[PDB]
Each structure stands twice: as structure tokens, then as C-alpha cells.
Design a protein around this nucleic acid. Structure first.
Ligand SMILES: [Mg+2]
Ligand SMILES: [Mg+2]
Ligand SMILES: [Mg+2]
Ligand SMILES: [Mg+2]
Lengths: 118, 57, 100, 233, 68
RNA sequence: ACCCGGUGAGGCGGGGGGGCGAGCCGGGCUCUCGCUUCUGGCGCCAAGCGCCCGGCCGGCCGGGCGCGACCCGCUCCGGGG
RNA sequence: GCGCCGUUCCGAAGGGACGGGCGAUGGCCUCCGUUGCCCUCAGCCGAUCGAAAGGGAGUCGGGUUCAGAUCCCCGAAUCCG
């Protein structure tokens, strides 16, 4: 057989996969960012209640490790309501605040009266 | 227009319909055609004079 | 008493060359079979000014003999070389100007 | 029948004329450093003046003799690990109700039965990797009077015994059916190695220049010979 | 045994055989890196004197030290 | 050994073969050559030939190998040493 | 000695893709993907970092707060995948 190139590259060897003879950790770690862990409480602020009454959203206080996708899935699961969008800001207190806009077939005032905030 | 806006354009916005169209201008295309023709015709002439130099020798 | 300035120049870091807008190492073409046995043509693409150099350089473009690929070179322009000029290089090249 | 559309289109691989084909270039590869090292190690064994105690291992028992020696040494291979367990089960059955000769192997056992003159033939590998393990052993076989030979392969001398390599392999005893064939080996091997031993002790090795360098010296010497011989007429 | 022959052969370092071997090996060791693994002892005899047994888990590295 | 330079370590050294010159009787020999100089063009991923092989009905459709692209070698070529 | 020098220099520095072949699961096992193996093809330039003023696709108008708006709301768009 011939050498086309003046170079010698390292030839491509077979390499296998991990077929481990014991798992390293015994069981997987449970998700400690639940749906309950990720929504702490809503805001009951007159500014937040203005936002609820007018702009059809819900102002929650959220764990700081959360995505907008995770906040949307948690609001969808805990209160059984679909969401148009989620806007997040982190406060100078340190908490993350989520402005959870609702799909307009739901009233934010009805779900706020459901969960208690008025 | 700016080079990443060229993803947005249609094909005919970005070239002209000629050989080397949108990459090379018309004047240099026609002189490149003439040159490519005349160099090869000169090579034919040198070939023929080579054969005749084989004929005289 | 102090380290004098001529000693300080060898450490660098303030006395290094200003090579930001320079164009390249102006070299001849490397040795190969065409340089050593015959010759090889290349055209002068453009003649250019290198910063920190009184000589003008010359982008000379050669056709690579083993690959379909054009190789481009920075010669130092001999005087009278123009753009669009064929430049030859090899053992069998002719003895005219800008022809190595 | 023929098609005038089919054209013969030759390529002119002249200088500057047409692009070079992908031809064989094994001579100009940038090899890895281990390959580069193990090649010019052999080149240095050809360049340098190799002393005769190392040079003597280059002389190898030839092919038609090596086949007869390995044919005789296949008769007396040591028992395999499975056959050990089979013989132990056989003696176990006899308990529940004269050992045959083998090859000796290793430099240690073979040298101790060269001094004791229990060896009748000593096979030596030629490529033992620290050579200092076996450098003395031809001269010791010469002194004790034991026929020694040198085979190509520590690898294949390590296949009589069931291993990877083996430095030396001795003959202590053989059987009566395979007695005269060992004598026919011992005669040729003895007259090729032991009886011709001062010529081995003085025979320096290597010291051959490169074929390019030999060719340049040869061109100068043949030019001087021609330019001196043409003057006399 | 062979080892007393290899011992007194490696005491004869000025001889032609041993100057040849030390020169060729020193070339070959200089071509390698400053620390690398020998797959086996170069001197089996000296390694055995110094504690080494040829079993699994004894390792030999050949390393160089720049001199002076 | 050791050092320096170049390179994507790409045609190194012998030898065949081919052509062109000088000298003797179509022949042996020494040496040179080995394919690109009128132009700001193009140039790769083989044409051709030779021998094998497989599926379908001498025809059809997909394959292989060697020439093409000379052989052999122990330092990648060079310069020091 | 902690480490240092060095950044292409004394490296087997490629884990990728078009096609051809082998098998294996999945879907009205059609045809396509998911792979695992073989043949082929493959340059680049040195891992990585380094600009809230450099390069860098694509959002504007109106209304709203005690304090935020090209970010919310209404209306018009638009880029990339
Ligand atoms: Mg157009
Ligand atoms: Mg960065
Ligand atoms: Mg920036
Ligand atoms: Mg910027």
C-alpha cells in the first residue's frame, strides 16, 4: 500500500463505551427544584395587585435558579392555568420575581381569589 | 448591503446572470474569454511549428 | 549604579518591534523539485508597502505543483517589477530582472 | 463498433506543466520519533565498528538447518499447563488405586548445565534485547565443549516453550529413536560454530558506510582508475 | 548462573563490548524524553540486587538528569 | 555523535529506458538533455490501454487490479562536523 | 523544589464529512433515520482566554408609574433556528 502524504497522522483506533461494573452513586439525586420549591409565594403589593387587576398577570416570588420555562411549567402545574409569557427580574433583595402573564381565557383576579391573594 | 444581510436576500439580488456574474465584472470577463481563446490558439500554432520542425529535421 | 539603557533594551517589553501593521516575513519561495530542476511561473499580484521597511514588497502568486491550490508569496520587489508580470524561479529560469 | 466520443486525454507531468499524481512517498514521510529511532539504531549497528562478541550473533544458523533443529526440538517440548494438570490427575488415579526428557530454558539453567557439561546442544537466540544476558554464553559453550548454535528468533525460541520469548534452549537428553538425528545436528552445528571459533573471536563487524556515500566514493575511485588507465594505453 | 557473568561483564565497562553497548544505549536514551518508562530492566542483574522482582506491579522508569 | 536551515519532512542516490550532439567498425562506449518564457486565461478529484470478476436477459447494469505515473536502496533533503 | 520557560517551538496534535459495502433495531419494517464495523476523503495552526467605546443578524410608534419602560400595555413589524 502507498503513503500519499508526507505526514504520519495518528491512526484512528477503536474506543469503547463505559460499561461500568458498579454505579458510582447508588441512586440518582432527587430533583430538589420541584414545582413547590420553585414558587415560594406571590406578591401582595398594591403595585403587584394593580398588575393583577389590570394586566392579567400574577406576580410571584421565585427561586433564583429558575428558567422562564420552569416558572411556566410550575405555574401551569400548581394552579392549572396556561401562561402567555413570563418576565423575570432579580430584586436587590436577592429574590427573583416573575410576572406571569396569563392566556386571556383566564382571569387573573379569579385565580388570585382562588389562591387567596386579594 | 452588510454581509450577514446577504442571508436574507434572494439569489438574483446577489449576482448578475453571466459567467462569473456577481463575482467579476463584464470587461474582465470578456478579456478573460479572449485571452483563454488566444493563448490556446497560440499553443496550437506552436504545436504545428513543432511538427514542422520534426518535418524539416 | 542603575542598569543602563542599552542593557535594558535586550529584555524587551518596551523595546520590542512594532509589528502590528506589517505584512509578513518577506521570503523567497521554499526549495522543491521545480526550483531545483526546472523553473516555475508566478505572476505579480500587487506591489505593496510594508511598515518599517524602505523596500516595497510583492505578492507573487504561484500554482502549487502537487495540489490544486494557488500559493502566494511575499518577495522583496526588485526595481522595475510591475504588477501582472510573470516571475520565474528555478535552475532553468532566464537571467532577467525579478527572476530568482 | 468503436465510439468517436471516447477520447484519449493524456496528462503531461512535466515541471510546471500538470499537477503531480498521488504517487508513493514512503521514503519522505515524517515518521514518529520511535520509528525514526528504531531505524537509525539499526543504521548505527551498520555504521559503527561492532565488537566480535556482539557481531557473532549476526551469524545465524541457516534455514534448512533451522527446520531440522526445530523439528527435533518439537519432540521435547515442555508440558503445557493443561498437561501438567492431566498428569497430576493421572498420578492421582494411580494413587487412588522415570520422567521423559524436556528442553531446558533460560540463561540461568542453561549456563549451569553448560558448566556441569549436562548440555548436549545449546540453542541461542540472536535478538536478545539486552545482549549482555547472552554475550558470554557462546564462549562458555566453547570452553566446556558444548555444541552451540544461533537461531533467528527469541520469539520462535519462545514458542517451543509456551511463552513469548526465551533467550536460550538446551538439549540435555534425547531418546533412542531421536538420537542419531541429534548427532547429525551436533556435527554440522559444531563444525559451523565451535571448530571455527578463533575466526569468530577476531571478526569485527559493521563499519559499512551508506549506499549514497559508498556510491560517491566508488564514483571517485572509478574516475581515478579510468583517468589513470587511459593514459598508459 | 548467568547473573554472575552479567555482573562481572558490567564491571568491565572499559572493554570494547561494554564501551560499544554504553555508547549505543546512551545515544538511544538521549533520543527519548527526560522521564519515560522502561518496559523491563536494562540491567536485570542490578535491579534484582537492588530489590526488584519480575512480577506484576514493579515498574521501572528510565529518567535523565542534566549534568554538572 | 553533535549543531544549523527548509518543508504539509513531495520526486534523494545508484541504475535501466528514451532523445540529441563528438569519435571507431546496424553495433559497444564518455557526456549532455528529460518535456512549461509573446499575453494580469484555465489546470485537482485520470482519459486511454491490458487482464480478471459479479447480478439480468451475444446484448444490459454495477465492480476489481496493473500500466499510465520505470526499478532498487540504510540515513527527509541540504550545509557544517 | 513549589514550579519555570516556551505558544509552533525536539509532538502518532483529525474522533469529522460525501459516497460505496456489511449487519442491527423502528415506523401502514414501503422508504427513511438511529447507529456499530470496513474502504475512501480530509491541511492549516495550534487548547483556551482577551473589548458592557473595536467586529457583531434582528423593534418601532402611542399610552401608562409615587418610583420601570425601545423591557409593561395597545398597535404595527422583524431576525434567527
Ligand atoms: Mg442581479
Ligand atoms: Mg472571548
Ligand atoms: Mg464588545
Ligand atoms: Mg461593540
Amino acid at each position: 500500500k502507498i503513503r500519499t502524504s508526507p505526514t504520519f497522522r495518528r491512526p484512528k483506533t477503536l474506543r469503547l463505551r463505559r460499561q461500568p461494573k458498579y454505579p458510582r452513586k447508588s441512586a440518582p439525586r432527587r430533583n430538589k427544584l420541584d414545582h413547590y420549591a420553585i414558587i415560594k409565594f406571590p406578591l401582595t403589593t398594591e403595585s403587584a395587585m394593580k398588575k393583577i387587576e389590570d394586566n392579567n398577570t400574577l406576580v410571584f416570588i421565585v427561586d433564583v435558579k429558575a428558567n422562564k420555562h420552569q416558572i411556566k411549567q410550575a405555574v401551569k402545574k400548581l394552579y392549572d392555568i396556561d401562561v402567555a409569557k413570563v418576565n423575570t427580574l432579580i430584586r436587590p433583595d436577592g429574590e427573583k420575581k416573575a410576572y406571569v402573564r396569563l392566556a386571556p381565557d383566564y382571569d387573573a383576579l379569579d385565580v388570585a381569589n382562588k389562591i387567596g391573594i386579594i | 448591503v452588510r454581509p450577514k444581510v446577504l442571508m436574507r436576500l434572494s439569489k438574483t439580488k446577489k449576482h448578475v446572470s453571466r459567467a462569473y456574474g456577481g463575482s467579476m465584472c463584464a470587461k474582465c470577463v470578456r478579456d478573460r474569454i479572449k485571452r483563454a481563446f488566444l493563448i490556446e490558439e497560440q499553443k496550437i500554432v506552436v504545436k504545428v511549428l513543432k511538427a514542422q520542425a520534426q518535418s524539416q529535421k | 549604579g542603575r542598569v543602563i539603557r542599552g542593557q535594558r533594551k535586550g529584555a524587551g517589553s518596551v523595546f520590542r518591534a512594532h509589528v502590528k501593521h506589517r505584512k509578513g516575513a518577506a521570503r523567497l519561495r521554499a526549495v522543491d523539485f521545480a526550483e531545483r530542476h526546472g523553473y516555475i511561473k508566478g505572476i505579480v499580484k500587487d506591489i505593496i508597502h510594508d511598515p518599517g521597511r524602505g523596500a516595497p514588497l510583492a505578492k507573487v502568486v504561484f500554482r502549487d505543483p502537487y495540489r490544486f491550490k494557488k500559493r502566494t508569496e511575499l518577495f522583496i520587489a526588485a526595481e522595475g517589477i510591475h504588477t501582472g508580470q510573470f516571475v520565474y524561479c528555478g535552475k532553468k529560469a532566464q537571467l532577467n530582472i525579478g527572476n530568482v | 463498433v468503436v465510439n468517436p466520443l471516447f477520447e484519449k486525454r493524456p496528462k503531461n507531468f512535466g515541471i510546471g506543466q500538470d499537477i503531480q499524481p498521488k504517487r508513493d512517498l514512503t521514503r519522505f514521510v515524517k515518521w514518529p520519533r520511535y520509528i525514526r529511532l528504531q531505524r537509525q539504531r539499526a543504521i548505527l549497528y551498520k555504521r559503527l565498528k561492532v565488537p566480535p562478541a556482539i557481531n557473532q550473533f549476526t551469524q545465524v544458523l541457516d534455514r534448512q538447518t533451522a527446520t531440522q533443529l526445530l523439528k527435533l526440538a518439537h519432540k521435547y517440548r515442555p508440558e503445557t499447563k493443561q498437561e501438567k494438570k492431566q498428569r497430576l490427575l493421572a498420578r492421582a488415579e494411580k494413587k487412588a488405586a522415570k520422567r521423559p526428557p524436556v528442553l531446558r530454558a533460560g540463561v540461568n539453567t542453561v549456563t549451569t548445565l553448560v558448566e556441569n557439561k549436562k548440555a548436549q546442544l545449546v540453542v541461542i537466540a540472536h535478538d536478545v534485547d539486552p545482549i549482555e544476558l547472552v554475550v558470554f554464553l557462546p564462549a562458555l559453550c566453547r570452553k566446556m565443549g558444548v555444541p552451540y548454535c544461533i537461531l533467528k528468533g527469541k520469539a520462535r525460541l519462545g514458542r517451543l516453550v509456551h511463552r513469548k520469548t526465551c533467550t536460550t534452549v538446551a538439549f540435555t537428553q534425547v531418546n533412542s529413536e531421536d538420537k542419531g538425528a541429534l548427532a547429525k545436528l551436533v556435527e554440522a552445528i559444531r563444525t559451523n560454530y565451535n571448530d571455527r571459533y578463533d575466526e569468530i573471536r577476531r571478526h569485527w563487524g559493521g563499519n559499512v558506510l551508506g549506499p549514497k556515500s559508498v556510491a560517491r566514493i566508488a564514483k571517485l575511485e572509478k574516475a581515478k582508475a579510468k583517468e589513470l588507465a587511459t593514459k598508459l594505453g | 548462573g548467568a547473573y554472575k557473568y552479567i555482573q562481572e561483564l558490567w564491571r568491565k565497562k572499559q572493554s570494547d563490548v561494554m564501551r560499544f553497548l554504553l555508547r549505543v544505549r546512551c545515544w538511544q536514551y538521549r533520543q527519548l524524553s527526560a522521564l519515560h518508562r522502561a518496559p523491563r530492566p536494562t540491567r536485570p542483574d542490578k535491579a534484582r540486587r537492588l530489590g526488584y522482582k519480575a512480577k506484576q506491579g514493579y515498574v521501572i522508569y528510565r529518567i535523565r538528569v542534566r549534568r554538572g
